[PDB]
């Protein structure tokens, strides 16, 4: 059993070890961001990539290093080298780029950032599983903000209830 | 069961 990289979503210099399951938006909400208060001039850092995983919705995106991706034997590693080459070409462009042009690039990154956050929001629930957990939660088939119905996903009911109870109540309405 | 979470 192996995970597959679908898309590289972002890159950062982050606190060493601020990667994997503790960096999901829902781990962060429950326990705090592992990268909280990281100032790259006051502590050791490492290059981390935000990964959208094949077959997992955007709420499950995690930060990873080249090291953790290789240790976990993830598929889609050709995408890493591509992303690095793309990012190297952008840095180069920025280094010899107008203030105006650099200005428009930075607005585009903010809008993209905003769009990516929408993908982690359940817009509505459209099915539920017959089977419940021992704690009585079904799983829910979720339609995500800003994504087509093809990108709906089954999600753990206990998890979805923490933040999207109103969607649950609308669905059973 | 298609639903999972990151552990």
- The reported resolution of this PDB entry, expressed in Å, is 1.9
B6 and A154 in contact by Cβ < 8 A? no
Whether residue A91 is found in the same domain as residue A105: no
Taking Cα atoms as reference points, which of A137, A172, A170 lies closest to residue A156? A137
With contacts defined as CB-CB under 8 Å, which chain A residues touch B5?
26, 60, 156, 159
User: Among A28, A64, A139, which would you mutate to test the B interface (most chain B Cβ atoms within 10 Å of its Cβ)?
Assistant: A139
Question: What's the domain count of chain A?
Answer: 2
Integer Cα distance of A44 and A20 in angstroms: 18
Task: Output the domain CATH number for residue A128.
Answer: 2.40.50.40
A169 SS3 class: helix
With contacts defined as CB-CB under 8 Å, which chain A residues touch B2?
139, 154
| Residue A16 CB-half CA count within 13 A | 4
Whether residue A102 is found in the same domain as residue A82: no
The secondary structure element, H or E, covering residue A50 is strand A45-53
Integer Cα distance of A23 and A35 in angstroms: 8
Whether residue A68 is found in the same domain as residue A153: no
Within 8 A by CB and 6+ apart from A57, the residues are A119, A120, A142, A144, A151, A153, A155
Determination approach: X-ray
Whether residue A30 is found in the same domain as residue A112: no
Enclosing domain of residue A38? 1-97
Domain boundary among A37, A66, A97: A97
Which tokens hold the place of A150?
């093809």
B2 and A139 in contact by Cβ < 8 A? yes
């Amino acid at each position: 059993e192996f995970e597959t990289i679908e898309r590289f979503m972002d890159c950062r210099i982050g606190r060493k070890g601020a990667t994997g399951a503790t960096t999901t938006i829902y781990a962060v909400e429950a326990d705090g961001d592992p990268n909280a208060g990281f100032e790259k001039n006051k502590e050791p850092g490492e290059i981390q990539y935000l990964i959208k995983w094949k077959g997992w919705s955007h709420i499950h995106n995690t930060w990873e290093t080249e090291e953790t991706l290789k240790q976990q034997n993830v598929r889609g590693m050709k995408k890493l080298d591509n992303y690095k080459k793309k990012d190297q070409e952008t840095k180069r462009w920025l280094k010899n780029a107008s203030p105006e042009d650099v200005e428009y690039y930075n607005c585009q990154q903010e809008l993209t950032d905003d769009l990516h956050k929408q993908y982690q929001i359940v817009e509505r629930i459209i099915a539920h599983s017959n089977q419940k957990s021992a704690a009585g939660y079904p799983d829910y088939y979720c339609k995500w903000q800003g994504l087509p119905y093809s990108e709906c996903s089954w999600e753990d009911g206990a998890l979805i209830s923490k933040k999207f109870q109103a969607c649950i109540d609308e669905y059973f309405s | 069961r298609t639903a999972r979470s990151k552990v």
